[PDB]
Subunit: 223 residues, 3 copies
């Protein structure tokens, strides 16, 4: 079942990528850069999840299955999602690449701490987990603080859209570390199959859902 | 022999890099960025192939993983060089350029995974790599060539020449891979080794000689 | 002792990062990018050295390889060179080609170091030598074309660039010297001796350099 679920996921990623490509052909004032980002996210995730479906992107460690392909996915997909969110805030105004790369750095660090934590045992695991959570809190502070102020500097209509997609992504963000801690990688309260379904369903909303909402909102700003 | 061949290769890469540096001192209207790219490609490949010559860049079928370490950097830089050639004298399209870099990096990764795989799984990864290559070719002779044409007859003529040069070499690599030990195993290991010594000399050094000379000639 | 030393180091990095953040709040004409770089260096190094303190960022090869050092340097050292390059270009046109030239040389340098540490006999010193050649080219650029960029940006800027260039160059030569003398090389210096050198040097490079660098640029501020 775990294999079939990942095959299905990869197919939905492919469909998502194709949809964003078709949208890119009639861009409606959205720069090609934002369509490229929207396409890379699902395609990369799709490839990583295909490796799990083929039984390659996981191994046995500490007597538990480590789905290391998820970290290979996130280390690329999650910084790109933040870039998408940051460019949305900056839409119709001057770019702040310093702030954007601040978010990219925090996010990449976050995913790494996750991988190291999953390879770790006892107190050491939760030291790395904790550092990852601290990174996430700082990302959230930026998202609803200085990055939202950039959105507001670009007018009521843009700011309204940014706030919507900021809440969408932020809601999904907090789910991942919550599921991680509850699941076999952490306290082990949640069954392996339960975790697998969570990390199949969440990513469909993040890797495809977010960009549908994001791109449509920006396209609607077009006359 | 395999060791000696790789030593020789690395020395040719060094000579190539030195030639591009000398050219960079009298640039003839070519931006320093295009000389830097031309220098990094051979130097990086040289270092990777030196690891094979020293018997480090392989594990034992025998997997020459040092080739993937090479290509994951050298091949995206070659595509960047080709993209900047198309855009020479006009506005840059960094979105298209990074589109090609992304496709190429994915391509080389699929190759590495395929080499570590067995049976149907190997050819699923290989196939994904081929699909990436087809999309790169479509871009090269489609939208990227249109950018070249927008930059005048002389530039377009040069771009088309280097596009065909690189495209010819591109298709050779996955063909040799499939035929060789990593794939169907029809071609002998020594034959594959020579192919992945000779091809790269034309790609890592040859391409930039043709590319840079063609662009320098546009100064006159 | 080696574990405790690394814990202490990581704490000093954290303090350094916080200091640069506070400086960033009252920037005094220094762009946010240079504060971001100053913060990432110590935080990344701190995290890498924490992995050694927890006994994760090293393994046996008979002899002990502190591979977390290379994970640190491959990110921290190119960022230091970027900081130095942006200092030269302060108040003037940027040369990102030269900047990325230095990044490329530096990344190659650190890789040769790692490969050398994994190597034995003649092979080790071939890799080391290639790393030293990279360093020589970095020094030539630093006191050659990059210094000429500094000079083009006025007396006061050039004077500051020269001072931080000499500061960093002095530290640069120390690393490959300590490497060669220590267990990774000739093995003249004891393991504990090397560990202390690669704890003290980095405090001057990862925190010291940015203190001198940022203060010098902030002093140039009018009002
Ligand atoms: C190792 C891990 C590294 C992963 C990093 C990759 C993700 C980074 C993405 C940054 C994208 C920023 C592009 C800015 C677009 C500017 C524009 O649209 O004009
Ligand atoms: C792009 C995403 C890549 C996925 C990583 C796949 C790694 C597979 C390791 C080989 C496993 C095996 O065949 O035993
Ligand atoms: C965890 C390691 C990841 C580190 C990668 C990012 C490091 C940050 C480095 C440089 C910041 C780049 C800022 C670009 C400035 C452009 C000007 C602007 O628009 O603000
Ligand atoms: C973590 C939850 C998000 C906190 C948001 C704080 C806003 C910061 C600000 O307004 O500058
Ligand atoms: C909403 C949360 C969905 C999952 C809750 C059930 C957990 C099952 C388990 O313990 O494995
Ligand atoms: C597919 C998975 C997630 C769905 C996301 C939202 C559905 C599309 C809404 C489009 C819109 O808001 O205009
Ligand atoms: C610079 C490019 C070099 C990359 C390849 C280096 C490979 C080193 C592997 C050493 C392992 C061993 O000694 O067995
Ligand atoms: C993975 C590593 C990939 C490294 C290769 C990528 C480099 C692309 C360089 C693009 C530079 C374009 C700008 C040139 C210019 O403006 O003159
Ligand atoms: C890995 C790469 C994934 C995609 C990343 C985005 C980079 C896009 C660069 C945007 C440059 C805008 C300026 C231009 O189009 O000329
Ligand atoms: C190998 C075969 C693959 C295709 C080669 C190039 C396909 C045609 C390029 C696009 C043509 C165009 O858009 O004008
Ligand atoms: C040039 C000479 C060709 C030598 C023979 C080629 C062998 C290919 C099949 C193994
Ligand atoms: C940030 C840098 C991280 C250092 C890497 C941590 C080492 C991996 C864990 C190895 C182990 O548990 O044996
Ligand atoms: C790692 C490989 C480095 C090669 C990368 C290419 C250089 C790109 C720099 C772009 C320069 C923009 C214009 C300038 O300021 O010179
Ligand atoms: C991973 C990236 C590795 C990059 C390749 C390693 C070696 C790179 C060296 C190329 C840089 C040399 C440039 C020297 C000339 C600079 C100038 O023109 O002033
Ligand atoms: C040009 C400069 C490049 C070479 C620089 C340093 C060489 C140092 C290596 C000598 C160590 C040999 C010791 C040994 O083999 O026992
Ligand atoms: C061996 C040690 C070499 C290190 C120092 C080199 C000093 C370079 C002085 C400036 C030359 C650069 C230039 O003017 O082009
Ligand atoms: C990790 C996978 C990366 C794939 C990148 C997706 C590129 C798709 C093609 C881009 C469209 C450009 C066409 C313009 C005309
Ligand atoms: C496992 C034992 C670790 C004890 C030290 C923890 C220090 C954490 C600092 C952050
Ligand atoms: C990943 C660990 C970070 C350690 C602390 C770094 C320094 C403080 C950063 C604070 C960032 C806050 C930005 C939003 C201000 C409103
Ligand atoms: C206007 C002040 C911004 C505060 C926003 C609150 C933080 C959002 C919570 C994220 C989790 C969902
Ligand atoms: C006018 C044509 C000049 C061609 C010079 C070729 C230089 C080759 C350098 C080494 C390549 C191996
Ligand atoms: C059993 C052998 C199967 C080999 C599969 C090779 C085909 C891969 C796709 C080629 C694209 C043209
Ligand atoms: C050597 C491989 C060449 C592939 C490209 C051939 C088709 C190009 C079509 C261009 C249309 C004008
Ligand atoms: C076309 C690229 C060069 C091809 C070289 C082929 C050499 C094959 C030599 C085989 C010798 C016996 C193993
Ligand atoms: C693996 C070696 C197979 C022979 C070469 C196949 C065609 C590549 C171009 C010459
Ligand atoms: C607005 C200030 C942003 C501060 C973020 C600092 C980035 C640190 C990256 C983490 C690396 C460890
Ligand atoms: C085995 C530990 C791996 C940790 C990953 C560190 C990040 C990758 C290397 C630096 C970029
Ligand atoms: C192998 C690891 C790759 C190293 C890359 C680390 C990042 C260093 C690049 C610095 C770029 C910042 C300069 C931006 C210019 C500001 C305007
Ligand atoms: C002005 C365009 C800047 C190009 C960025 C350089 C790409 C970094 C290579 C990794
Ligand atoms: C890392 C090994 C590099 C070998 C040589 C590369 C080609 C020559 C580079 C010369 C750089 C000189 C820059 C300073 C100019 C004054
Ligand atoms: C046996 C202990 C010796 C430790 C010596 C440490 C020297 C530090 C000097 C830094 C430069
Ligand atoms: C850890 C070394 C710090 C050196 C800073 C020097 C004092 C500031 C000079 C201005």
């Amino acid at each position: 079942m775990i294999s079939i679920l990942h095959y299905g996921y990869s197919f939905i990623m492919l469909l998502g990528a194709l949809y964003f490509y078709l949208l890119s052909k009639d861009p409606k004032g959205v720069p090609a850069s934002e369509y490229l980002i929207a396409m890379v996210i699902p395609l990369w995730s799709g490839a990583a999840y295909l490796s799990i479906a083929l039984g390659q992107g996981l191994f046995q460690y500490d007597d538990t299955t480590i789905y290391y392909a998820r970290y290979i996915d996130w280390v690329i997909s999650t910084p790109l999602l933040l870039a998408a969110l940051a460019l949305t805030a900056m839409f119709g105004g001057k770019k702040n690449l310093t702030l954007l790369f601040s978010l990219v750095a925090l996010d990449v660090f976050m995913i790494i701490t996750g991988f190291v934590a999953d390879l770790s045992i006892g107190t050491t695991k939760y030291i790395w987990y904790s550092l990852g959570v601290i990174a996430l809190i700082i990302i959230l502070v930026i998202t609803f603080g200085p990055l939202r102020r950039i959105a507001l500097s670009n007018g009521t209509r843009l700011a309204r859209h940014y706030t919507r997609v900021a809440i969408y992504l932020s809601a999904l963000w907090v789910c991942y570390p919550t599921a991680w801690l509850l699941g076999p990688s952490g306290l082990g309260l949640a069954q392996e199959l339960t975790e697998v379904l969570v990390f199949i369903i969440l990513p469909i909303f993040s890797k495809v859902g977010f960009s549908i909402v994001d791109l449509h909102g920006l396209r609607k700003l077009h006359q």
